[PDB]
Amino acid sequence: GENKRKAKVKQIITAESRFVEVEGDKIEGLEEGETPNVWGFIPIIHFKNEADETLKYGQSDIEPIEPLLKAYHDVMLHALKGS
């Protein structure tokens, strides 16, 4: 209709089941609470770019170049301002 709906939803997904709770306006599709998983594995795959054994999360390819990008921006902006 013309009504605005706000919904903060938190859900824990596990191999044995997935839990979901909503703090806000209703959502028709989601059944609140724990619902069992039809299979005993977690249906989410983690992709870990530039994976390191000592890091939980992967690393973006922009991270090594980021300080150089900052330096490039600094030099270019200073040159433009001076010009």
Partner 1 sequence: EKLRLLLNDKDKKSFTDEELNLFLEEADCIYCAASQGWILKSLQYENTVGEMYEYKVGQETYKSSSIKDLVSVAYQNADKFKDMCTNKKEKGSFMLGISTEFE
Q: Which residues contribute to the site for partner 1 (CB under 8 A)?
A: 67, 70-71, 74
Q: Closer CB to partner 1, residue 1 or residue 67?
A: 67
Q: Please, what is the minimum distance in Å from the beta carbon of residue 67 to partner 1?
A: 7
Gyration radius from the chain CA atoms: 23
Show the tokens assigned to 67. Answer: 């300080």
Q: Closer CB to partner 1, residue 58 or residue 64?
A: 64
Pairing of strands 7-13, 35-36: unpaired
Candidates 64, 16, 19; CA nearest to 40 is 16
User: By the 8 A CB rule, do 61 and 48 touch?
Assistant: no
Q: Please, what is the minimum distance in Å from the beta carbon of residue 49 to partner 1?
A: 25
Q: Closer CB to partner 1, residue 52 or residue 74?
A: 74
Q: Please, what is the minimum distance in Å from the beta carbon of residue 77 to partner 1?
A: 13
